[PDB]
């Protein structure tokens with residue numbers, strides 16, 4: 001085909017042999033699932049503003065650009081592999097933990113640090129959570145995915161990237177400890193509650209990759225396949241601390257997995273049959289129940305027996321993974337945003353009966369709160385109107401307040417300081433910002449300019 005030859009001559013230098021990546025990102029069909037071919041075409045011709053991807057309009061014509069786009073989105077004749085041997089060969093260890101002191105090199109409170117993902121230019125900022133000033137900034141792997149995870153004591157932070165790279169960062173020494181490429185297209189990762197294991201959930205290959213959390217060395221590649229042998233992508237991996245287990249959502253088979261690690265490296269799944277494909281898990285506070293979205297509403301499964309105990313039909317497809325729990329009149333309640341409709345659904349835990357449907361302007365994506373806050377903070381991140389953060393009173397279940405940090409720009413995602421006194425909102429824009437708010441007065445206290453900040457993650461709240 002003409003695309004391949006054009007690719008070798010003009011592209012392989014940076015995007016690598018087989019489109020696996022190199023200087024530039026991986027360019028497999030899975031890698032480009034969020035990039036429409038017309039957008040890829042414009043990137044190839046004119047480049048990406050303010051990056052190392054320059055335009056090629058002067059080197060190739062319309063037919064050559066179309067040929068290249070067609071090649072990038074075409075499935076290869078055989079699926080690319082990423083073996084145990086590939087994984088081990090990719091490990092690097094610039095600052096092994098054995099060689100580093102175990103003392104914070106800074107004066108900021110280690111438990112109030114924010115890890116801030118700067119997705120516009122693929123950097124990470126480490127923020128002093130009391131001064132709201134950076135103590136470190138470093139370039140990350142391209143297109144971080146899934147939000148960072150922490151070691152149990154909050155000293156170490158683990159990043160996963162779209163194209164399969166895992167990064168271990170030591171917050172005390174402000175240094176990259178190790179990196180490894182666990183797959184070719186990665187969904188997210190999870191850290192065991194005893195701090196020993198990293199479990200990586202991959203789309204490509206369809207597998208789980210188990211790493212030693214101290215140096216990102218390979219422990220075992222676990223192919224994702226149901227009991228009948230049918231291959232599957234991993235949708236997401238989660239930690240269930242009271243069960244000392246990983247819980248795995250599988251994209252393409254009627255199974256979900258629990259991998260216990262109390263007795264050692266979690267290499268053997270306990271398989272639980274599900275009636276329908278189930279991903280985007282949420283866990284009840286006691287981790288006895290799993291709330292998932294089925295390909296057909298919400299499904300409540302008991303983890304031990306795997307029995308389906310209740311079904312909750314809700315408008316549109318609710319984003320159960322982002323839902324949160326709190327006590328309202330001395331009884332657990334659960335609230336979830338929605339991907340296609342503009343509503344916040346509130347469910348009663350005791351009976352799994354819906355309590356109230358709070359109507360909003362548009363579909364949202366994020367939800368957060370704090371023991372010290374009387375509101376649940378959410379958004380309409382996915383709607384046509386999307387510059388407002390909504391504060392839903394935990395008791396009245398109504399939008400009590402609204403926050404509009406940058407009128408006209410996408411506002412979304414909220415994280416608090418460890419004591420809940422301040423809330424940090426992201427304006428997801430090239431001319432974006434991290435906006436600090438007093439969580440009780442609700443007034444803007446500070447604003448940090450950033451290129452498309454996405455999530456920020458408070459050590460204290462993430463490990464508490």
Ligand code: HEC
Nearest residue numbers: 010011013014023024025035040043044048051052053068
């Ligand atoms: C190195 C100097 C490169 C060469 C030669 C080519 N590309 Fe590239 N490309 C490169 C980088 C560093 C990046 C990432 C830029 C960023 O956002 O930080 C890219 C990006 C792309 C993309 C977008 C991928 C995405 O995930 O959004 C595409 C579609 C792409 N590049 C295609 C492409 C083609 C077809 C090339 C030869 C014709 C080519 N690139 C050359 C680095 C480099």
